[PDB]
Design a protein around this ligand. Structure first.
Ligand SMILES: CN1CCN(C(=O)Nc2ccc(F)cc2)CC1
Ligand SMILES: [Zn+2]
Ligand SMILES: [Zn+2]
Ligand SMILES: [Zn+2]
Length: 461
């Protein structure tokens, strides 16, 4: 049960308008043969072009929605749509291109997939709502065979060039003309009633149907993300390291200890309400405060209503108005005024953040997290948290070169005394680096309106 058996049944109802008379009884083996691909009994890492839902979820970074619309059967032109927004027109003689023959269209397909996926994945997963023409068009731009490595590196081969007779990964495929060993999944095989638009619109209002192939390709991948990451959640699935994952995660831990520690020193709240991850540990273990935890899993569909986080049924809830409330990646519709918040901005463009469902995004860093759409109005009772570095640690160096630090946001005894010491200058520069890393990864920081770093200077007396 590792791969999808080629002898598994494939439901053909969705294919019978493009392919009338298609056998109701069909396997992946006969379907693949129909598409013009010869597996010839091969045990070399490519058992099936199609993959299980579990295998697709593990390779969510490789997903590219694909749809083909029949503009006019190898005699009429086809519109090729991709979830990148690209529409190509292939002739057999929202980015829309005019009619060109397959030999030139296939060069553009390789270029587009290579530029989209080189920093995300080792493969491509064509996400379909299969009706017929997309499967029968694959023979015009896809070549299959045994698993291979790139001619210029150790990465698996994803492209093929008929000009040079060589194979390349997404990084070294310039001028390559064929997609080599792609994977695919038909969303219609999951058990849906009704067409694509009707099932998609049930969960998302951000992707309209402008009636082009790329609209369907976007809606297809969106519907798939909703089913695999919104309605169904699995935080036990690990994902490879493709970018600044370790640095971003380390930065969030530094930023959270800093911000929370300074809030408790500046306003001396007697109680802190830590709302969110049921596995959370105190970010400031030495603070005086009564630390009270509240369990709430990451919301992947809609942001939590704040009234439901405080709903206690037939008993009195804890008093949230006493002290401060810490919402570290705990997404709510409207934060209370006495809060410290970290809220991921789903609009951020990065290799970790994939487009999601209903304005939301799929942030993949060790685990996959579908996050609801970022909404500025959640923060009406708060203000943006400004950058500051605080330290009560002694001014001692131990064991890099130097330019003296001058900054109003270095809250240390040395700065109060007139001149930043070398230890606090190094630590400040490191902390600013960690902070900028976290902000550029998409995280946004918010705090109660009375927060004032001027209150931190008297903690040195
Ligand atoms: C059995 N109930 C469960 C909910 N509940 C509660 O206390 N919620 C709450 C969360 C965060 C906060 F800050 C205050 C209250 C009351 C007891
Ligand atoms: Zn390579
Ligand atoms: Zn959508
Ligand atoms: Zn110092």
């Amino acid at each position: 049960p590792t791969h999808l058996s080629v002898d598994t049944k494939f439901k053909t109802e969705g294919l019978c308008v493009d392919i009338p008379g298609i056998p109701k009884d069909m396997t992946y083996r006969r379907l693949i043969s129909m598409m013009g691909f010869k597996m010839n009994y091969q045990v070399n890492g490519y058992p099936n072009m199609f993959i299980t839902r579990e295998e697709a979820i593990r390779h969510v970074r490789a997903w590219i929605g694909f749809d083909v619309e029949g503009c006019h059967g190898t005699n009429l032109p086809l519109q090729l749509g991709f979830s990148t927004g690209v529409n190509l027109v292939a002739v057999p003689t929202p980015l829309m291109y005019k009619g060109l023959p397959w030999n030139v269209v296939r060069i553009k397909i390789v270029q587009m997939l290579s530029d989209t996926l080189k920093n995300l994945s080792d493969r491509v997963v064509f996400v379909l709502w299969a009706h017929g023409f997309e499967l029968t068009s694959m023979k015009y731009f896809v070549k299959i065979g045994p698993e291979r490595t790139c001619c210029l590196c150790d990465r698996r081969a994803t492209c093929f060039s008929t000009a040079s007779d060589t194979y390349a990964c997404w990084h070294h495929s310039i001028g390559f003309d064929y997609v080599y060993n792609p994977f695919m999944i038909d969303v219609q095989q999951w058990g849906f009633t009704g067409n694509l638009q009707s099932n998609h619109d049930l969960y998302c209002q951000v992707h309209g149907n402008a009636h082009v192939a790329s609209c369907d390709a976007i809606m297809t991948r969106c519907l798939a993300v909703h089913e695999c990451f919104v309605k169904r959640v699995d935080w036990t699935i690990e994902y490879p390291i493709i970018g600044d994952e370790l640095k971003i995660n380390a930065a969030c831990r530094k930023v959270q200890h800093m911000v929370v520690k300074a809030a408790l020193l500046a306003d001396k709240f007697p109680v802190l309400h830590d709302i969110g991850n049921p596995k959370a540990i105190k970010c400031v273990p030495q603070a005086d405060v009564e630390w009270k935890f509240y369990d709430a899993q990451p919301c992947s569909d809609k942001a939590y209503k704040i009234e439901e986080l405080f709903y206690s049924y037939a008993t009195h809830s804890d008093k949230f108005t006493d002290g401060v409330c810490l919402f570290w990646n705990c997404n709510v519709d409207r934060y209370p005024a006495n809060s410290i918040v970290c809220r991921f901005d789903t609009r951020v463009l990065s290799n970790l953040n994939l487009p999601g469902c209903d304005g939301g995004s799929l942030y993949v860093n060790k685990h996959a997290f579908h996050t609801p759409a970022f909404d500025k109005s959640a923060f009406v009772n708060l203000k943006q948290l400004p950058f500051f570095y605080y330290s009560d640690s002694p001014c001692e160096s131990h064991g890099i070169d130097y330019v003296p630090l001058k900054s109003a946001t270095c809250i240390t005894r040395c700065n109060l005394g007139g001149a930043v010491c070398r230890h606090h200058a190094n630590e400040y520069r490191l902390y600013l680096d960690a902070y900028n890393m976290m902000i550029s990864a998409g995280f946004s920081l918010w705090v109660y309106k009375q927060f004032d770093t001027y209150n931190l200077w008297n903690t040195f007396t």
